[PDB]
């Protein structure tokens, strides 16, 4: 296959700077030139850098000119981009493309969180059903984490049929937050357990908890 | 800079319906008979992925439904037929002259029949209680269409300011939406009041279905 691997995202402070990567597999065409693409939270696509197909000529968006290097090692098959004095106006999802003609191949994309603001963990507290009519419904609330991102799944991706995981929610503190629920048979509460899993990687965080009524 | 504007900026479309989402640059993106206008479509937690390529070239591996056209400054991306998996938000790009820009992106909804609500309200967990906080979530799930509101009252004063909410992508497995909206508290400003509840006021339901409880009682 043609992949491409991002490394280097995470969380920043204001001023400092960051050196991002992406590697590749079998392409090597050689008429393709290597761009930088990100995404705000929330927003369309932005594109960031270039680097010719060829070394000579890079090039960079005027929100980012002067603070940015964007070089490719063709020996590794490996691009970098190097950014300094970063705001938190360069908040966001970096991506990594390449190709001949469009931007063909895509990395999966590596978030970035320019903020002097601590990481913390969640706290995961259940959404418990009644008590109750046919149809039952149960989640988990991830309360109070930084920064994104958070994953849920439940009973270890075992049950993936009527779970909704909504989109984290940044609170008024700064902090993060979200739910995720699932529509179960109520004639099942009884018999089968229902255990979100929950891992805030940043912190190290890794939490299963159990949903049960009352 | 060439300023890509993109329209429409939202398009609910049916599937086996014509979904056509234009894109006009400030100037022209030609040399020869080549027009360096690409489409691409992300669907949300994704990258996105290429459709078409210099104008019109359907890009391999995709489907023949979609496909682009035009030249110096009016572009088109059509589908036809639509389908319910082509959720997404479609992204025109200029690859003429640098700084290389895109659009600013179409909102494709699909379209299908009006779908309820099925509305449960949670109450908070003594879990948190024991902390500063009591957080309340109103479920509104598997919807259509998207708009709805949701109507917090605590002993009967409408809530504003301290509810916020989320909504799913579109499901694509049936097509609808689901929706939390949670109700942020203070613990002494949650053990001051006795009832709790969200009325939810939705197209599908033929007036508005409250859901509530009563702080203590099961």
């Known amino acids: 296959q043609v992949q491409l691997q991002e490394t280097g995202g995470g969380l920043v402070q204001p001023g400092a700077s960051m050196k991002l990567s992406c590697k590749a597999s079998?392409?090597?065409?050689?008429?393709?030139?290597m761009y930088w693409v990100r995404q705000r939270p929330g927003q369309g696509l932005e594109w960031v850098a270039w680097?010719?197909?060829?070394?000579?000529?890079?090039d960079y968006n005027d929100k980012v000119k002067g603070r940015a290097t964007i070089t490719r090692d063709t020996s590794s098959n490996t691009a970098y981009l190097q950014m300094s004095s970063l705001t938190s106006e360069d908040t966001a999802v970096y991506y990594c493309?390449?190709?001949?003609?469009?931007?063909?191949?895509w990395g999966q994309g590596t978030t970035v969180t320019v903020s002097s603001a601590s990481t913390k963990g969640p706290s995961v507290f259940p959404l418990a059903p009644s008590s109750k009519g046919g149809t039952a419904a149960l989640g988990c609330l991830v309360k109070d984490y930084f920064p994104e991102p958070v994953t849920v799944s439940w009973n270890s991706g075992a049950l993936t049929s009527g779970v909704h995981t909504f989109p984290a929610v940044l609170q008024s503190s700064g902090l993060y937050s979200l739910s995720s629920v699932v529509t179960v048979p109520s004639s099942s509460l009884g018999t089968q357990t229902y255990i979100c899993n929950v891992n805030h990687k940043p912190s190290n965080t890794k939490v299963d908890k159990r949903v049960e009524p009352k | 800079d060439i300023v890509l504007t993109q329209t429409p900026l939202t398009l609910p479309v049916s599937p086996g319906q014509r979904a056509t989402i234009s894109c006009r640059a400030s100037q022209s993106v030609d040399y020869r008979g080549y027009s360096f206008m690409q489409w691409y479509q992300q669907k949300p937690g994704q990258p996105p992925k290429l459709l078409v390529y210099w104008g019109s070239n359907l890009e391999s591996g995709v489907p023949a439904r979609f496909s682009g056209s035009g030249s110096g400054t009016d572009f088109t991306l059509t589908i036809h037929p639509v389908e319910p998996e082509d959720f997404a938000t479609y992204f025109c790009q200029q690859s003429y002259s640098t700084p290389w820009t895109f659009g600013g992106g179409t909102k494709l909804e699909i379209k299908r029949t009006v779908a309820a609500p099925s509305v449960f309200i949670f109450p908070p967990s003594d879990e948190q209680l024991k902390s500063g906080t009591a957080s309340v979530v109103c479920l509104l799930n598997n919807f259509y269409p998207r708009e709805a509101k949701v109507q917090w009252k605590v002993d009967n004063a409408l809530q504003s300011g301290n509810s916020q909410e989320s909504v799913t992508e579109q499901d694509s497995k049936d097509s609808t939406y689901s929706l939390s909206s949670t109700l942020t508290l203070s613990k002494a400003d949650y053990e001051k009041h006795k009832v709790y509840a969200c009325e939810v006021t939705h197209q599908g339901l033929s007036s508005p279905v409250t859901k509530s409880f009563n702080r203590g009682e099961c």
């Open positions: 079998g392409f090597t065409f050689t008429r393709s030139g």
């Open positions: 493309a390449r190709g001949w003609g469009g931007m063909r191949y």
């Open positions: 680097i010719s197909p060829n070394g000579g000529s890079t």
